[PDB]
Amino acid sequence: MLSFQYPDVYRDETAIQDYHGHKVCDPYAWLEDPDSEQTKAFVEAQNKITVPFLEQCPIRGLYKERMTELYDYPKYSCHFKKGKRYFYFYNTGLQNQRVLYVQDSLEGEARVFLDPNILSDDGTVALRGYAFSEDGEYFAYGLSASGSDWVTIKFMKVDGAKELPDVLERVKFSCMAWTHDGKGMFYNAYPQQDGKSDGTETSTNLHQKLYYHVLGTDQSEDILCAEFPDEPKWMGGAELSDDGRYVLLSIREGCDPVNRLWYCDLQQESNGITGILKWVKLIDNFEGEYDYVTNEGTVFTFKTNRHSPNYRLINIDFTDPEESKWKVLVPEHEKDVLEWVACVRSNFLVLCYLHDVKNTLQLHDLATGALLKIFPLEVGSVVGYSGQKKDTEIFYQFTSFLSPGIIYHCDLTKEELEPRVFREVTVKGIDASDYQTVQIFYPSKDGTKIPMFIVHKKGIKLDGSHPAFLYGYGGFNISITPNYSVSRLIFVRHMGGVLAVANIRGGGEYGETWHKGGILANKQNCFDDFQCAAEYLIKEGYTSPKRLTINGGSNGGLLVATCANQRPDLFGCVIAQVGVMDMLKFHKYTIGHAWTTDYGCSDSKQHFEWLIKYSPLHNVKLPEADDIQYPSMLLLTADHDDRVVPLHSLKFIATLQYIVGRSRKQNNPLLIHVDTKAGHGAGKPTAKVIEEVSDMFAFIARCLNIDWIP
Numbered sequence: 001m002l003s004f005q006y007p008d009v010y011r012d013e014t015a016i017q018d019y020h021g022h023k024v025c026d027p028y029a030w031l032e033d034p035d036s037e038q039t040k041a042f043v044e045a046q047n048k049i050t051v052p053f054l055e056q057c058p059i060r061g062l063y064k065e066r067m068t069e070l071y072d073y074p075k076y077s078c079h080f081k082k083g084k085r086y087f088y089f090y091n092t093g094l095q096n097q098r099v100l101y102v103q104d105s106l107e108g109e110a111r112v113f114l115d116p117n118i119l120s121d122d123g124t125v126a127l128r129g130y131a132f133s134e135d136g137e138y139f140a141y142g143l144s145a146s147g148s149d150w151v152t153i154k155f156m157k158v159d160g161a162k163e164l165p166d167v168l169e170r171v172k173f174s175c176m177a178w179t180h181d182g183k184g185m186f187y188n189a190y191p192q193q194d195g196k197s198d199g200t201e202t203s204t205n206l207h208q209k210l211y212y213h214v215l216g217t218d219q220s221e222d223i224l225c226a227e228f229p230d231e232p233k234w235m236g237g238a239e240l241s242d243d244g245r246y247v248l249l250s251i252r253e254g255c256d257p258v259n260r261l262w263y264c265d266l267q268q269e270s271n272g273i274t275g276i277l278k279w280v281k282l283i284d285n286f287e288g289e290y291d292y293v294t295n296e297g298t299v300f301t302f303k304t305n306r307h308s309p310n311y312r313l314i315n316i317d318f319t320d321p322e323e324s325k326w327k328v329l330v331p332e333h334e335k336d337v338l339e340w341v342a343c344v345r346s347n348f349l350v351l352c353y354l355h356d357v358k359n360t361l362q363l364h365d366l367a368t369g370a371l372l373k374i375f376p377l378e379v380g381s382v383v384g385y386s387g388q389k390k391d392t393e394i395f396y397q398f399t400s401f402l403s404p405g406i407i408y409h410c411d412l413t414k415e416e417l418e419p420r421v422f423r424e425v426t427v428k429g430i431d432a433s434d435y436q437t438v439q440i441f442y443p444s445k446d447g448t449k450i451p452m453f454i455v456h457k458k459g460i461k462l463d464g465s466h467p468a469f470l471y472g473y474g475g476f477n478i479s480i481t482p483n484y485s486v487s488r489l490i491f492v493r494h495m496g497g498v499l500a501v502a503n504i505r506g507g508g509e510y511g512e513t514w515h516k517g518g519i520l521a522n523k524q525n526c527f528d529d530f531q532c533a534a535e536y537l538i539k540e541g542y543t544s545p546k547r548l549t550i551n552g553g554s555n556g557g558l559l560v561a562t563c564a565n566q567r568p569d570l571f572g573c574v575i576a577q578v579g580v581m582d583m584l585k586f587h588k589y590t591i592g593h594a595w596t597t598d599y600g601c602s603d604s605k606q607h608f609e610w611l612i613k614y615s616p617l618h619n620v621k622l623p624e625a626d627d628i629q630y631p632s633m634l635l636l637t638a639d640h641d642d643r644v645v646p647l648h649s650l651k652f653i654a655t656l657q658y659i660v661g662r663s664r665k666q667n668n669p670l671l672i673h674v675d676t677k678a679g680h681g682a683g684k685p686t687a688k689v690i691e692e693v694s695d696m697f698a699f700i701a702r703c704l705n706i707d708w709i710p
């Protein structure tokens with residue numbers, strides 16, 4: 001099968017670093033420089049063998065045509081009201097970017113408000129963040145180029161959709177919050193740095209500042225409102241209270257769901273916003289999360305995890321702020337995670353729970369916390385919502401494995417609340433009733449029961465004959481909940497596949513204890529959980545190792561890369577997207593310093609000892625048994641991935657090809673594809689998304705010799 005040879009790649013054998021007495025060799029350290037001729041030649045040589053491999057089999061074309069056909073369905077966000085007008089996002093089917101529409105009433109004719117498609121030939125300029133002024137008359141929006149986290153904020157007057165002159169540069173990981181006087185907007189920016197700031201650089205991002213931009217002025221005139229020069233990793237994001245009276249500052253350091261919470265009573269500023277604000281340090285530590293829900297005068301309602309791993313709602317009165325005085329408005333549930341909370345129609349709260357990895361949605365009274373209404377939902381996820389304090393109605397969007405889903409509307413001025421289907425779209429080509437989703441709970445190595453969703457054609461024999469696609473993430477308190485994926489359903493219908501999603505530790509599915517169960521010293525739980533998921537699928541007859549594919553992205557790319565090293569015998573195929581591979585150096589680049597709350601940091605002797613054991617880059621090793629080789633592997637990355645700098649995948653594939661790819665017994669390919677004008681994944685145009693899934697499933701089809709089923 002291997003009709004190509006791996007490129008020559010220089011090994012710098014002098015690259016030796018001491019980590020607490022452990023010598024680590026890093027012969028591909030030079031691939032850390034994205035700008036060198038050496039690195040560019042490496043990328044070109046790798047793509048030169050990967051692309052013809054992927055495109056040799058007719059199956060890529062059949063997949064791509066079927067993806068193009070089935071992905072072509074209308075896609076809407078929830079309606080949301082701002083001031084006098086309604087807005088929603090909409091893609092007719094195959095537009096590169098969804099388009100923002102405005103209408104003057106729910107029954108009124110809609111018109112294009114902001115169309116990102118006209119900003120590039122190839123749809124690689126994408127909306128990233130936006131905020132309307134309190135009165136709905138002005139609009140700020142972030143644009144990112146080529147998938148980079150870097151943002152340029154531009155502005156529009158809503159009436160007439162008029163471009164304004166204001167442009168804000170050096171924006172990254174930014175809040176956008178307008179003061180209610182409509183004078184201007186808070187946002188974050190980074191100090192100048194040497195070299196590039198376009199998504200191709202690896203430079204660390206430190207000293208993020210909070211600024212205020214007065215509409216109608218140059219950026220050079222913006223007011224510095226908060227900075228933390230003694231704490232270069234702190235990130236202070238601003239929002240206005242619902243009554244416009246307070247600026248709330250949430251300071252983060254790292255990725256843990258915790259924040260300091262400072263406030264500024266704007267009425268108490270000596271002369272409006274003119275410099276560093278008179279911050280009152282209400283919560284001045286990182287012991288808990290405090291997510292603002294609403295306030296009534298000085299009584300502030302927050303979603304918190306303080307003393308409550310599954311989250312709860314508390315009231316903190318700013319005039320009596322000590323923790324012993326806080327009121328518990330909605331107590332923590334013993335098992336279900338309070339995922340998010342919104343305040344709507346003055347005195348309702350909308351609460352969204354995660355119950356065994358499925359969403360529920362409930363209306364509660366603001367004053368007492370009492371449950372008033374359950375909004376009935378099928379099993380799946382709530383993935384969109386609108387309705388803020390002043391609004392008198394809600395929209396919410398539901399999705400699941402087997403249907404694109406439904407947008408509901410509920411008029412909250414009615415005595416008897418009755419949600420109605422507002423929009424529903426059918427995907428002709430996939431009959432949902434041919435398939436089923438089951439949820440099982442399998443024991444991991446230590447006996448912990450892990451949830452797994454399995455999706456497959458009805459009536460299949462569990463004889464181990466089926467190809468399977470097993471997906472995981474396992475980190476950063478992120479819950480992996482049901483979602484509609486055309487690309488995965490084509491695998492099921494046209495490749496005869498079984499789909500599986502394992503809810504491994506590290507995620508947020510069972511609250512903070514689930515998260516803590518897959519971080520730091522215990523990160524190996526994630527890999528154990530995921531290996532156990534594969535073993536369960538095999539034992540129960542859904543699949544066999546030779547027909548099993550695993551996939552994950554980012555922290556999920558680490559997951560699958562590590563599982564390949566640790567259990568090469570368990571998997572036939574591995575696709576690792578935009579993965580963190582160098583666990584010893586991840587913290588040196590761009591925003592990687594923020595992930596040490598999940599992983600630890602190699603500067604620490606204790607953390608190094610955890611990290612060295614599973615770092616994919618440092619654990620490539622020929623399997624001992626003559627009958628065992630590495631699975632076929634595909635790494636996907638891109639040249640403007642400034643979230644997880646591509647050096648991770650570059651160094652990892654060089655190592656795989658040298659240590660494993662050169663052995664006689666290795667016949668499974670070990671490949672990387674590096675895309676151009678693309679980044680970590682957010683804002684990826686439709687055309688690239690289609691090419692990407694076509695690459696992935698063609699890879700699977702070719703490595704496992706799977707026949708297309710028309």
Ligand SMILES: *[C@](O)(CO)[C@@H]1CCCN1C(=O)[C@@H]1CCC=C1C(=O)NCc1ccccc1
Nearest residue numbers: 173252254476553554555556580591594595
């Ligand atoms: C991927 O897993 C997912 O994109 C990468 C690699 C490890 C974690 N990760 C992230 O993107 C983390 C997960 C959740 C948010 C992340 C992040 O780095 N966000 C940027 C950011 C913004 C504000 C404060 C801290 C970090």
